[PDB]
């Protein structure tokens, strides 16, 4: 959480896009059927939400 608030509100969007790409790949692999570490979906969703909340509260 507090590991994020020390970033210049620009690279966090880059991390957000990267996390979105990783989440989509994980969902795609689960749909195919070759995924086992299913906790990654929740982990990435929570991370994206945290960074979105930091963006919104920055103003």
């Amino acid at each position: 959480a507090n590991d994020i608030r020390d970033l210049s509100t620009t690279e966090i969007q880059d991390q957000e896009k990267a996390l979105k790409e990783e989440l989509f790949n994980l969902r795609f692999q689960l749909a195919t059927g070759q995924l086992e570490n299913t906790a990654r979906i929740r982990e990435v969703r929570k991370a994206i939400a945290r960074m979105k909340t930091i963006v919104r509260e920055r103003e």
């Binding site: 979105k20 790409e21 989440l23 989509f24 969902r27 795609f28 689960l30 749909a31 195919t32 059927g33 070759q34």
Partner: protein, 92 residues
């Protein structure tokens, strides 16, 4: 709606696997996605170029689990055909 957001997940059955050979891939999309938003989203994600897209709406099936009845989700199925010269989405 984000490009990652429009495309939900592939549909892997016997029919879709049988059609993958002819450069046709079957996906799920947002219930509110046009036939051209999907085309541009696929071009953006998988880095190919698309010839045609065909969409179709599926209603909700009726299921029961013991004294309790409800309808499954509502799907929006799409089929992307890719041009003569471009990469092939893996699926695997």
């Amino acid at each position: 709606m984000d490009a990652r957001d429009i495309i939900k997940r592939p549909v892997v059955t016997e029919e879709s696997t049988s059609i993958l050979d002819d450069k046709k891939y079957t996906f799920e999309v947002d219930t509110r996605a046009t036939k051209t938003q999907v085309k541009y989203a696929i071009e953006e994600i998988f880095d190919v170029k698309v010839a045609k897209v065909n969409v179709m709406n599926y209603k909700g099936k009726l299921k029961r689990m013991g004294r309790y009845a409800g309808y499954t989700n509502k799907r929006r199925k799409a089929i992307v055909t890719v041009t003569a010269d471009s990469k092939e989405i893996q699926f695997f």
